[PDB]
Point group: C3
């Protein structure tokens, strides 16, 4: 035992987890809203619309200790997504994305949320309609990332038929985010 | 990441999933009853007795798009199983079976149900009394197949002590099916 | 299929499972209290304090068929642990421990309980505050072992924020057990 190595998906955690952030509201009280995912170096972030639906002031908190204020770029009710913006100081951790990767049924996936961080393991039950997984999906990880064993982004964890969780396919999430950036809410 | 391959049990899905079918009732209304498993080329299928307990007309629907009517060969209350029959057009997808394979505690297993298909992942908690697994077992996959990472049949998912699901060992399921074929309900 | 081998964590089961015992009370009635873990050859065992909180007479039952009476060495309310003692006949199965092993987030873990034995699979969601896992933790495995794919001890399953289970890190559990052995209850 001492010689060998445990089976583990910590590799996918080290690659993906730095990019998943906490999302807060600062009214006047500091409340925890949910999780979120840093998509690129420009400083754009994806989260659930319901997380930021009633935010007086939005705050984002990285795992490395940094704390930015975020402005709502726009949302999309149908997919319950929302894009936030923050100033990117030199060096931002971003969620690994592979546009060429084709998600397959049976693929191992980790759901990464930041209520410290909590990570749960499952598989892709059904390929995206949305992507299904049996990894626990909850408010503590709602708005966070779903990634495969390599750490590549498979979807955005979302809430709202038992035992199964939902994530918005990363391919759809990318397009929706782009559209919100270009205009704002889109129909 | 782009170079490497995700950890996945899609191999077992491709081999086993084509053999797991949807089971319907057609009264006079079309209702979804549950899932089922094509065992052989003769056209015999296994499902839960409770799925077909009140079926005016039984219909079976493959993943490839085909739709047959099925006749109840017989059932077995004690194990809550039931065998159906359909005409096998040339080419029927059958559930991989390995009579030589010895199921071990800790073995990875996928529960395959067809409410599109939903697949969940677990292990064999206890070897069959029935086989136990922590893979989600639900009406959406009740009557469907439980298979290992190779895609070989380990059991038939069944309902009716929390967090654990039950499957009838494939070795028992085979014998019971044979007996029903030979006579009908057996005691 | 016939040639290849199923993916499985039965190796970790064979190594660790013999060391996880059933724990009973014998009033005057024989009641099942919970699970426990044989730590060393001296005959010391760890379990939850709530399991042994009201035991007139404590009995321990190995998987190999042996049955000892156990005496409460002492407990620790804060961590809900308790150490029992039994006479070690030549040959006692002990839980594999690796003091050098550093638990990482994403590590595969099996929760081993003895209500026959029930084993569930998960990962380390958060490294220990206590260790978190998405492996099912329940009364049937409360007080039992959490081990990685090698079979090394990662924690002691404990009860008392949804979908997640808790285990006391093996490093903390070892120290607490030592202290109880030295004195008794410690503050």
């Amino acid at each position: 035992s001492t010689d060998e190595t445990p089976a583990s998906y910590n590799l996918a955690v080290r690659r993906a987890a730095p990019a998943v952030v906490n999302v807060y509201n600062r009214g006047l009280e500091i409340r925890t809203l949910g999780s979120g995912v840093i998509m690129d170096q420009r400083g754009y972030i994806i989260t659930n619309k319901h997380v930021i639906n009633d935010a007086d002031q939005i705050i984002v908190a990285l795992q490395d200790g940094r704390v930015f204020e975020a402005l709502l770029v726009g949302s999309d009710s149908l997919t319950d997504l929302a894009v936030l913006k923050i100033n990117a100081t030199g060096g931002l951790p971003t969620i690994p994305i592979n546009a060429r990767r084709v998600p397959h049924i049976g693929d191992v996936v980790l759901a990464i949320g930041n209520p410290g961080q909590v990570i749960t393991q499952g598989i892709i039950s059904a390929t995206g309609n949305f992507l299904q997984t049996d990894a626990s999906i909850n408010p503590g990880n709602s708005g966070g990332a779903l990634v495969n064993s390599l750490g590549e982004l498979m979807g955005i964890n979302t809430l709202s038929p038992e035992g199964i969780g939902f994530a918005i396919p990363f391919q759809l999430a990318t397009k929706i985010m782009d559209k919100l950036i270009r205009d704002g809410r889109v129909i």
